[PDB]
Every structure is written in structure tokens, then in C-alpha cells.
Amino acid sequence: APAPFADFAPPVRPQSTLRRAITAAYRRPETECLPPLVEAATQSKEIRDAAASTARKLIEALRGKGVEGLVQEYSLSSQEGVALMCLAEALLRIPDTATRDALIRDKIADGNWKSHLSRSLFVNAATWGLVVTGKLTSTVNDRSLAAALTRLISRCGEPVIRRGVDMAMRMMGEQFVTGETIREALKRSKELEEKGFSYSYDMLGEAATTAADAERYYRDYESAIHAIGKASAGRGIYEGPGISIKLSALHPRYSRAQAARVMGELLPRVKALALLAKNYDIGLNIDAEEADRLELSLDLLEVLCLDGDLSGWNGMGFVVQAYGKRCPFVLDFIIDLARRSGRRIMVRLVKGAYWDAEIKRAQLDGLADFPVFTRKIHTDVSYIACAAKLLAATDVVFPQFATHNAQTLAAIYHMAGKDFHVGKYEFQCLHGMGEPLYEEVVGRGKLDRPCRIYAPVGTHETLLAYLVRRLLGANSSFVHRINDPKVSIDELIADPVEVVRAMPVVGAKHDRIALPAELFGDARTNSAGLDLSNEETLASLTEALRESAAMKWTALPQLATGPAAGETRTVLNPGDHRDVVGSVTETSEEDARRAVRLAADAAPDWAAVPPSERAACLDRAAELMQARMPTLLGLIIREAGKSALNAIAEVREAIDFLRYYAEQTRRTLGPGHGPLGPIVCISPWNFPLAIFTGQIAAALVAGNPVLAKPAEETPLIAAEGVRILREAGIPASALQLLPGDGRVGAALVAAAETAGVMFTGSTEVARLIQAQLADRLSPAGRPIPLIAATGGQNAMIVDSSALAEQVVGDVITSAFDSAGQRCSALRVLCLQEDVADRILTMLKGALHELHIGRTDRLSVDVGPVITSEAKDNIEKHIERMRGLGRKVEQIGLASETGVGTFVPPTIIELEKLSDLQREVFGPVLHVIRYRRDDLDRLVDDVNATGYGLTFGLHTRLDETIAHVTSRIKAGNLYINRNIIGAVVGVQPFGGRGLSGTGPKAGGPLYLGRLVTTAPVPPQHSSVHTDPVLLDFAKWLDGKGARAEAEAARNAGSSSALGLDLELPGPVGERNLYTLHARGRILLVPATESGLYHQLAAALATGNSVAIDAASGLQASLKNLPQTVGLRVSWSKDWAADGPFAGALVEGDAERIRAVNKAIAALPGPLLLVQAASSGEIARNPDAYCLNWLVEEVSASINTAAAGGNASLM
Ligand SMILES: Cc1cc2c(cc1C)N(C[C@H](O)[C@H](O)[C@H](O)COP(=O)(O)OP(=O)(O)OC[C@H]1O[C@@H](n3cnc4c(N)ncnc43)[C@H](O)[C@@H]1O)c1[nH]c(=O)[nH]c(=O)c1N2
Ligand SMILES: NC(=O)c1ccc[n+]([C@@H]2O[C@H](COP(=O)([O-])OP(=O)(O)OC[C@H]3O[C@@H](n4cnc5c(N)ncnc54)[C@H](O)[C@@H]3O)[C@@H](O)[C@H]2O)c1
Ligand SMILES: *C(=O)CC[C@H](N)C(=O)O
Ligand SMILES: [Mg+2]
């Protein structure tokens, strides 16, 4: 068999000294990067004065030389302007100019435009918003825009419509693009080519999703090289036109993880285009993209420049991004490569276009620092220093200075000195934007320095795809400052080098941008990830992973008295059974019962450890796991079948649980919050470290000793987690490990001294535990608390406003990551009928680009399922659907998978959602289509499964967001992003119905469930009072029940219903946390006062009730106000009147036990039950705790989804 990790992530080539200098600078501190940049960018006082003069002379011409004018002519509001442009865009999608004018004249200008024009008019309004207002809104308020469009048409008629159409036509055909086609762009370029300009054409392709998209982009590029070469007609690479390409357009898996495919499949295609450009002797420039593709692209640039088939041509070009901390070392490397190869490489120096996306990515991944600067002035100094380096090597490279900043331009112009010849260097600008400035530079009558115009080419659809990124003209852009008339010229010709030099601390990070580790401020330290695009990281990880596979991992029954003997068997890698991972010794049912007794007898000693010291253990346990992360990664990869990327996330999530529960402890717990006692923690195989650790850390920090029962498939990583927690100071008596199967779990739950159970697993097993536990009562006569986190049937809804490329990406990740073995995984994709065929073609194309196999290779996307039984179960489902006529799409599996348990990613097209009647825990996406008027019915079908865990929605339309998020009943919502990877303390995780009891893991109510008296969580309060509660309290006052009326009003104030908070997280995301009503609560009263207390508790938290008619208390609620009676029903057959969302029970100990057994028999969800005796209701106003009568909802909205980040102005 192949040696573990012997082929994890070998580099494309051995890393030269010059390449190593690049990698070493990836995330270098910003205070280290600047001093050498300032040294390099300095110039004589004489030069700086001449620079500021030239830069002032340029800026004064500009100030002395469209959509705004339209808004003025018709006195449009901002929303009218935006809506008018969306209307124009949709009228231009009408091809025949005469048909269009007839629709305007006879139907639009008069009738409701809403009849004549399956896709909102306002799909692109975020982009038109930028045009009109200069500000970017992530989503579209389509009801506001509809009203504005009606208003402006009813006011001004066909004339305003005509003017909108012509404006949009001019902007889309001549301003945003030089032309719609390359032939048209070439015809339009004649005029400025005569005035001394040159051109390079950008064909607006990028981010291929399928093989078909990449082939299409390739032939687009090929056919443009022909038109450009023919038009060039021998002018050469400096005077004549060239083309610019993006590598992500030519392959659907352009990434370091797929480097072998990139060199074998993408390189040959770039070489064939370059050969064509060589024959016409035109430039071919490789555009720069995200920071994690930079070094990968250098390997393509190296091979192309050493390829003798391309010799004799100096047209190959390459962009370098000055906002990147690697820029000067990249330039050293290129300059040396130009010397070795003898190719005069065309180096286009830009600042960079992905800034806010890079900030968000680094934060999300928990990396050590950013790969770009965080102050714009730092990018300027870097640009000017790299320009000096490039102007010293014009013998071997051709520098191309792409900038619109007049201060940068003047600096470069004077730095280059008096000698110039065409071919020494050039400036560059963007079509429609930079000509005014550079019409003051080009020509013998100005500065006599040439400028290449970068010219987008594309249809309306194409230009709009990333027209937002191109606009971002933000609060720090030179283009934005030259307009702003409160900015003086003296301000605009300020020298960035001298300003940075005289700052108190050179190169300081931006004050308002958090390093990834500091995302949560003083609350806690963020866990740290690893950069799998960093060759140094991959190299050192390769060795640690190899060394992890040599260990003899074991897991034993670690009882309080010491290791126990038992039945021993191997643990095999699910991706290859020949790979023995370790040995597990499993627990006898006798030692299971014995461990509970030792924990019971040791419980007082652990409760007596002060909360702050308990949390301090957890903080030490977090630090141990961060240090051992590489070794833990390797065990999770091989024991549980996970990819390295999913193993990193899992170890982070364990670290985060430990620090989050430690901080929550420091915020809440005191002497009056006593532990429950021994808690049994039972966990699933699919997050074998994270969920394992989170349940145990919570229970322990709340003062409870713990019996940890790991899933039988993943004991080894569990045993390691317990080793670490004990090393951190958890005493052996406080944390005992009991490996084994469901019998060991069932014996622990049943044991006499078990005070609480934390279960994560399947819904049916949680139903068996609930049944065990209804037989039992605590020594105080109350039910044994149960937290059950169970399965999901998670849907995503996509309408015709979504961007297919974003959707396919989020779907492929949500459904097939970890082979779909996430409780959160996407199970049902719901596609609006108009875009269903297009998205499904893309999805299937992207499916076939996934790599399935054993997960000790970075190249693997989808690993094995955990066992042969899981495989057989998943494959039964697939073949059933296949036998019912449903279209089934499956990738092909390589024969190497036969040594493991694999299921291929699978797409199944269903007719109705009720076709699918059970959670299928594998890589199996079901697809259904819906018509837009049936959206509300669709949300019902989603809710009707009974599950309620994760849910996703892709739309740009506020009315659809409002509608859908107010009707879906699920605990974790996701807008315009994937639906997996909830982050501790940011998206507190957990659902409702068949998906769990709550409270949410990694949320502020979790610890309260594990003590006898719940504390008040941080920020847990609400100023809102439920109005039916208030009517009930008045009814009680009317009936003479003064004391109960007062209790009712106190419950109204104590309720946290309506709490609405935003939680700190990464930039580019809004993460919200809210408390809602749970639903209909089953009330089982014994006395009239008991019923009034129960009803006040339920109403104060927004719930309706079903009251046990067998109680005989019907006459205690005569003459209810109508508002309260709407919320009240009576029930004789509890099972018929479900599903309920909780229960309140009054009785003595045996009444409680009987009612509890009858509630556990109700079909459907596990109910969170609270019981109290009549005397407890009288003595304790919190006998029924309001924390468990509300439902937590987490929502995460990707606010960078329109293409940029507004807040990072
Ligand atoms: C001809 C041509 C061709 C291209 C490009 C430009 C031109 C003129 N660009 C885009 C370029 O990188 C840049 O985004 C804009 O052109 C604006 O730069 P200026 O010098 O015009 O303006 P300006 O001088 O106002 O500089 C603005 C720039 O500063 C940076 N910035 C803003 N805030 C910052 C902060 N807080 N911290 C650090 N930096 C900050 C950004 O890079 C921003 O673009 C590009 N880009 C790319 O990545 N790949 C490519 O292939 C191209 N192609
Ligand atoms: N809501 C969540 O946060 C969440 C997270 C992960 C997984 N899950 C769910 O867990 C399931 C997959 O994991 P699984 O296959 O390991 O679950 P499972 O129900 O098969 O097994 C879970 C655990 O319970 C034990 N067990 C089995 N029978 C038992 C019994 N009669 N009494 C006591 N313990 C018993 C097992 O040994 C194991 O430790 C899926 O349904 C998935 O959706 C939910
Ligand atoms: C379920 O398996 C846990 C999944 C995790 N919380 C996530 O991916 O959100
Ligand atoms: Mg099982």
C-alpha cells in the first residue's frame, strides 16, 4: 500500500533561493515591510519639488476639463435614478430597436411596466446604485425601486424613459467596454492610436466553473488574438495592440491544491495562445488574481519563458500587485528569470483589485497576518519603490506603470530621468477613465511618454458580471479624491514616501482592521489556521503528518482509578482498510456502571474548583491543541476520512469551544449555580474532535464530572482529546473515557447517578435515550436534563436574481464537503424554474471536476464515507430513486477507492420535496424546481419535513429575503453563502423540531442548561413585552388573581423574547442572533394557580399553548380576552394535537414521571420538558425557566456578495 502522506503536496519544482524569498514575505508584519520600501522610493529634494509641480500641473488640467445630468434634468431621487437605469437595461435586452420603441411608446410610458418586462427588473440595481450614488448596497430594495419607477414614469412619461435608455446604451456600449465585440473595440481604437496611445484588450473572462466554460473562454481568447493580430499588422509589441488573459478562465480547478492538473492541463493551453501571439508578434499579458494564486502562476511563467518553442518573441507579460507584501521579491524573481531566459518580460505594475476580499479571507482562515497592506499609503510607497527597482532593469524587462494617480505618475516620470525611447517603459490606464489624465502626458506637446489603454470587451451581460469590482472610486481612491472639491491639490500632490517616513511608527497596521487572531477583542483569542497555499507550511506539515502516521495511537477505558482492560481491536482508515491507524480497547458494561459511580463520588471535589480555575484549565487545553494541531490533523485525516482542510477547521472549532466556554464561564458562573452532577456526553463520528470537545468542555466548566463516550468509529482522536484535557489539569476523576458502541452509551445513560445527558447523533437514537430517561427522576424529583443535537434535511432556495457561479460554488461545498457527512450539509437544492436548467448544467459540470480518494493528498476534494454499512445505506437510497425514474448524475470512481468505503458525489432530480422522507447522510444532493409565485408553498414543504437545522437562501432581493426568512423555521440561516462551518460564538449552532432540543452549541445559553440554577447570560435581555401576556395579566387582575397577575407581569419583563443582536465576526459578513417563540407549548397543570403560572411563562415568551383537558381546569379560564383565546387550545389526545415545541408540567414526583413517560411517547420531535411541584411554583418564581421557552435563531449574511465590501470605504 502507499505510504501515508508520502505524496501529500509536493511542489511543482524545487524552490529556488529567489522563490523562497517570495514565500518568506507572504504574511510578513507590516512594520517590517515598509522601511526597505521607503529606502528604495526616496528621491532628491530637487526631484520631489519637480514631481509635485508636474503633479499639480496635471491635476489642474483635469479639474479644468452624465448620469448626474440626467438626475438634474428630471429632478430624480437617488432611487428613481437607479430604477430608471434598471428599466433601461431591461429594455436593451430587447434586441429589435423598433420593437423596443413600440413597447416604450404604447405600453411602458402609459401602462404598468410591471406587465411587460421571471426575473426582477432590479437584479443589477446594486451596480446601478454605485453608478448613481457612489455607494454600494449589498442587496436590492426592490419594493422601493418599484415605487420609484412607477412614480417617475407617472410624472414624466416617455421622455425620461427615452433619455434613460440612451444613457444606459452609451454607458454599456462605449464607457464600461470599448466595444461589445473585439472587432467593434478595434474599430473604436483607431482614433486614440492616432493620438499616440496603444491598446491592450481584456476579454472579461474569469472563474471557469466547468470544463465547458474553460474551453469557451479559450476559444474566445484564440479568436481575439486573431482579430488583434490581424489589426496589429506588424506594428510589434510596443506600438501595437496586445491581449490580457486570466488563468482562472482557462481551467476550472486553478489552485495550488490542484497544481498537478494546472501544469498538465492549463499550461498547454496558455502555451498554444502564446504561440499564436508570437506569430502575430503581439503582447499576451497574464493578469494577476487572488493572493493564493500568485506563486502558482510563477511556475507557469517560468515554464513558458524557458520553452524554446516561444523564443524570439518578447510579448509575454505578467502583472505584479503592489498592494502585496511579496511584490519586490516577486520582481527580483521575474527580473532574474528574464536574464536566464533572455526574454524581455513585460511587467505591468498595478496596485491591486481584490483588497477587501483578501482582508475577509485572512480573517476567516485565522491566518497570521494579511498578504496585502492595510493602509492605502503603504500601497503607494510600495508602488513607487517597485517602480525604482523596475527602472534600474529596463535592459532586461519592459516596465508598464498602470496608474491613474497623478502623484504616482509624476514621481515615476521624474525618477526615470531625461533619456527615453519607445520601448524603454510605458504608462497604462483604463478605457473610459484614464484618457483625460493621459491626454496630458502623451505626445510631444506634453510629457512625451506613451500610454497603453486597457480596454474591456464584452456584451451587457458580461460587463455587469464584475462591474462592481471595477468601480471600486471609494473614500481613499485618487479618482474619488480629485472629484471631491473639499480635497485641495496640495492634498493631492502630497508625497506618500515622506509622509510614511515621518509617522511615529513606520508601517503600522490600520487601526480599524483587526488581525485574524484579534477578531474577538478582549473576549477571547481566535484560533489560528494554516495556509495551504504556503510552500513552507506544506513542507513542514508533510513531515508532521508523516510523523503522525508512525505513532501507535491508542484509546483505552480511562476510568478514575486508571486504565481498564477490555476487548481490543484495530481502527482502520476508512479510505484504505490496509492502513491500520491504531488500537481501541472498549468498555465493559460493568466498568461503564463503575465509572458513573466514581464520578458521583468525585463530584464534590470538582464542583469545589473555582469557576475561574476550571475555565483556566480549558484555556490551557486550547493552547495545547493549537500547538499539536499538525499532529491532530493527521489523526483526523486517517481515522475519520477527512481532508486536511476539513481537519484544520475541526481543530480550530475545538480550540474555539474551549475558549468560548471559558470566557462564558468567567462572565456568568458564581456559587449559586451548582452543578447537576455526573454528565454523560455521547458524540458522533463525523466531528470526532470538535463536538466531542465542546460537550465535554461545557459540562466540565459548569462544575460537572464527565463520562465521555465517543462514537465507536473514532475513539483514537477522542482519547487524544482526553489526554490533552487531563494534561491541562482536568483531574482523572472529572473526565473519564469509555470507548465502545451504543451499549456503552446506553449503560451510562441508564446508570443511577447520571444527572444529565448531552447527545449529538441521529434523531432515532436520541429518541431511545429520551425513552430511557423518562423512566428516571433526579434525587430531587425532577427530570434528568437532555440536550439532543440531531439530524437535518437542509434546503437552499435560489431565485433568478442569484449569480449562478456563486451558487454552484456554495452548493458544491455545502453538499459534498466531507462526503456530505455534516449534519449541516445541503440536502435539497430548490431552483427557480427560469434559471434551473442553466444552474443544473453548471452544477453537473462542476461535479465532474471533483477528486475522490484517500485524503492524505492535498489534491483530494471528497473522501470516504465512514463504514461499509453507511455506504450500503447511502447506495440503497440512490438505487431506489434511480429505479423510480429520477435522473441520477454520478462522478466516476477510480479503482484505488476499492480498498476503502467510498460513495461518489451524486445529484438526484426529484419532482416534489416529499419524495425525500429521511436524512441521507452522504454526498447526495437532491434538486427540485419551483415557480416564483409558489415560493411560499415551497417554504412550507421545507418546514413540513419536521427538521430545522440549516437553511440557505441566494437572492439579491430584499422582499424575498424578508419573506423567506420570516417563514422558514430553522435554527441556522445563511444568505448568499454556503450553509456549513458554523463558527463558535459567531453562528451559535443548533436547530429545532427533529433537529434538536437546544440550547445552541457555541452560544450563550448552553452553560445555563448544565447547572441547577441558570445564570443570566451576557447581553441576555429584551425591552419588549409580549402583548398577549399583558392582556392575560389584565384578565387575571379582573378575576381577582392579584398574585398571579403580578407574576405574569414579572414574566413579561424577565422574558428575553425579542432579543436582537449582531455578533462580532469577520468583515464582509453580518452575523445576527435573535430569540423568538418556540411554538405551541404543551401545558400539563394540576392546580388553578399552577395553570396561571404556566400560561404566563408560555405567553411571556410568545408561545401558544395546548392545555391537558384531563386536568379538569377548564372552568379556570372562563371569558378569556380574544387575543389570549387565540393562543389557547385544549387537548384530550396530545398525540393528535402536535407537534409541540416544549412542555410545562405540574405535579408530585410520580405525576411528573407518568406525564414524562407519556410525553416521550408523543411522535415527532424530542420535547424540552420542565416540571415543578405545586409547592415549588409557590416558593420559586423561576420554577419554570424562561430561557428554555424561547428559540434561538442565528443568521449569517454575506455582505460582500455584490462584489465588494462597502464598510471598508
Ligand atoms: C491598465 C490597468 C490594468 C489593471 C489595473 C489598473 C490599470 C490602470 N488593475 C487595478 C489597479 O490595481 C487598481 O486597483 C486601480 O487601478 C486603482 O489604482 P490607482 O493607482 O489608479 O489609484 P489609487 O492611487 O487611488 O490607488 C488605489 C488602490 O490602493 C489600494 N488600496 C486602497 N485602500 C487600501 C488599503 N486600506 N490598504 C492597502 N491598499 C489599499 C488598492 O489597490 C486600490 O486599488 C489591476 N489589478 C489587479 O489586481 N490585477 C490586474 O490584472 C489589473 N489590471
Ligand atoms: N445537530 C448536530 O449538531 C449534529 C452534529 C453532527 C452529527 N449529527 C447527526 O448525527 C448523525 C450521524 O452521527 P452518528 O452516525 O455517529 O450517530 P448515531 O446516532 O449513530 O450515533 C451517535 C452516538 O450515540 C451512540 N449510540 C448509538 N446507539 C445508542 C443508544 N441506544 N444509546 C446510547 N447511545 C447510543 C453511538 O455509539 C454514538 O456515540 C446524523 O444524523 C447527523 O445529522 C448532528
Ligand atoms: C454537524 O455535523 C455539525 C456541522 C458543523 N456545526 C457545521 O458544519 O456547521
Ligand atoms: Mg451508528
Numbering used by the authors: 14 to 78, 83 to 134, 137 to 491, 494 to 1230
Quote the study's own text.
The bifunctional enzyme proline utilization A (PutA) catalyzes the two-step oxidation of L-proline to L-glutamate using proline dehydrogenase (PRODH) and L-glutamate-γ-semialdehyde dehydrogenase (GSALDH) domains. The two active sites are 42 Å apart and connected by a buried tunnel that is hypothesized to channel the intermediates Δ1-pyrroline-5-carboxylate (P5C) and/or L-glutamate-γ-semialdehyde (GSAL). The PRODH active site is located in a (βα)8 barrel, while the GSALDH module features Rossmann NAD+-binding and catalytic domains, which are both characteristic of the ALDH superfamily. Kinetic and conventional X-ray crystallography of PutA from Sinorhizobium meliloti (SmPutA) were used to capture high resolution (1.47–1.88 Å) structures of states along the catalytic cycle, including a novel FADH−-proline covalent adduct in the PRODH site, the intermediate P5C bound noncovalently in the reduced PRODH active site, the covalent acyl-enzyme intermediate of the GSALDH reaction, and noncovalent complexes of GSAL and the final product L-glutamate in the GSALDH active site.
The structure of the acyl-enzyme intermediate was captured by soaking crystals of the E810A variant in 40 mM L-proline, 1 mM Coenzyme Q1, and 1 mM NAD+ for 24 h and then flash-cooling the crystal in liquid nitrogen. Glu810 is the conserved glutamate in the GSALDH active site that facilitates hydrolysis of the acyl-enzyme intermediate, and mutation to Ala is expected to slow the hydrolysis step, allowing the acyl-enzyme intermediate to build up. The structure of the acyl-enzyme intermediate was resolved at 1.74 Å resolution. Electron density clearly showed the presence of a covalent modification of Cys844 in chain A. The electron density is consistent with the acyl-enzyme intermediate, which was modeled with occupancy of 0.83. The covalently bound GSAL is stabilized by the same interactions described above for noncovalent GSAL, involving the oxyanion hole, aromatic box, and anchor loop. Electron density for the coenzyme, either NAD+ or NADH, was also observed (occupancy of 1.0 in both chains). The coenzyme adopts the pose associated with NAD+ prior to hydride transfer (hydride transfer pose) and is distinct from the pose associated with NADH in which the nicotinamide riboside has withdrawn from the catalytic pocket. Given that the coenzyme is in the pose typical for NAD+, we have modeled it as NAD+. Interestingly, the ion pair gate is open in the noncovalent GSAL complex and closed in the acyl-enzyme.
